Amino acid sequence: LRPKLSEEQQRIIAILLDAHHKTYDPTYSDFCQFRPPVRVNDGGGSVTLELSQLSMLPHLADLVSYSIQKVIGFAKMIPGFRDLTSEDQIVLLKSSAIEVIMLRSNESFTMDDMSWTCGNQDYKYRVSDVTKAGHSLELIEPLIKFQVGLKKLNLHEEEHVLLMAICIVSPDRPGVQDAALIEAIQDRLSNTLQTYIRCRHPPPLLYAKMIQKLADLRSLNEEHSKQYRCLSFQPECSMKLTPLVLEVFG
Numbered sequence: 001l002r003p004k005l006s007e008e009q010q011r012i013i014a015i016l017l018d019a020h021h022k023t024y025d026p027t028y029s030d031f032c033q034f035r036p037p038v039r040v041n042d043g044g045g046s047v048t049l050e051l052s053q054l055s056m057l058p059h060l061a062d063l064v065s066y067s068i069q070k071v072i073g074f075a076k077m078i079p080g081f082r083d084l085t086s087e088d089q090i091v092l093l094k095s096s097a098i099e100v101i102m103l104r105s106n107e108s109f110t111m112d113d114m115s116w117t118c119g120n121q122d123y124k125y126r127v128s129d130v131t132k133a134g135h136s137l138e139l140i141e142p143l144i145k146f147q148v149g150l151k152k153l154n155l156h157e158e159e160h161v162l163l164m165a166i167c168i169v170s171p172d173r174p175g176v177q178d179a180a181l182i183e184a185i186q187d188r189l190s191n192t193l194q195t196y197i198r199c200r201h202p203p204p205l206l207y208a209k210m211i212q213k214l215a216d217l218r219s220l221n222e223e224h225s226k227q228y229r230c231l232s233f234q235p236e237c238s239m240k241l242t243p244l245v246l247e248v249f250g
């Protein structure tokens with residue numbers, strides 16, 4: 001059966017598209033405001049050198065912090081998110097932050113060269129930049145695998161916004177209180193997505209592939225958290241971060 005999108009589901013799609021359009025700048029016009037990228041000699045990707053310099057960390061922390069602000073803005077516009085308690089809203093935002101960042105970064109990701117192209121060459125990010133921020137291959141390899149896999153799905157903007165919203169409003173996050181209300185909000189979103197795929201996505205399993213991407217995001221989140229922990233041990237690392245990054249990850 002291919003039921004039609006209800007007027008409510010059409011309203012949800014319109015709200016989420018409008019939310020993304022208001023919170024995502026496809027021109028990357030604010031990037032010149034961040035602390036500048038620094039790309040030092042590190043041809044070998046030396047762990048000792050990367051930790052001593054953390055050359056790309058001030059820029060990447062400003063980029064992530066900026067992205068988190070946009071995610072907070074987007075989440076506030078998800079139908080039903082404001083009905084949740086502010087304690088639950090915060091638990092959901094903190095727990096999903098890195099996952100939504102990985103999802104939203106897909107829009108600038110390019111399979112042409114496996115980079116995130118954000119305007120000029122200074123804002124063309126690669127694997128080597130994440131290593132320059134003190135991260136290891138245990139995070140980077142699955143991260144690129146994820147970007148390619150997601151890119152290959154060729155999601156409609158409607159599916160992309162629905163996927164980010166479903167990611168945020170997850171009832172299975174540690175510390176949530178009203179899991180039942182969260183699940184009801186997510187089910188409303190999930191039903192919209194499944195109905196949308198069946199009636200709007202032309203052929204040539206997409207919903208199941210999008211659900212697997214959410215499971216892939218949990219693993220990446222766990223790996224990122226382990227790496228953030230190592231990075232936090234580096235003396236004076238907090239100066240290279242932001243108050244928002246320190247709260248979300250620390």
Ligand SMILES: CCC(CC)(c1ccc(CC[C@H](O)C(C)(C)C)c(C)c1)c1ccc(OC[C@@H](O)CCC(=O)O)c(C)c1
Nearest residue numbers: 023024025060061063064067070101102104105116125133
């Ligand atoms: C450079 C790659 C990547 C990929 C997800 C990234 C960047 C940095 C890191 C280290 C993070 C560190 O562990 C800590 C927490 C700061 C300490 C990692 C692991 C991946 C990245 C690329 C582009 C990005 O955004 C482009 C657009 O979407 C931005 C506009 C908008 O979102 O609205 C963002 C957000 C991130």
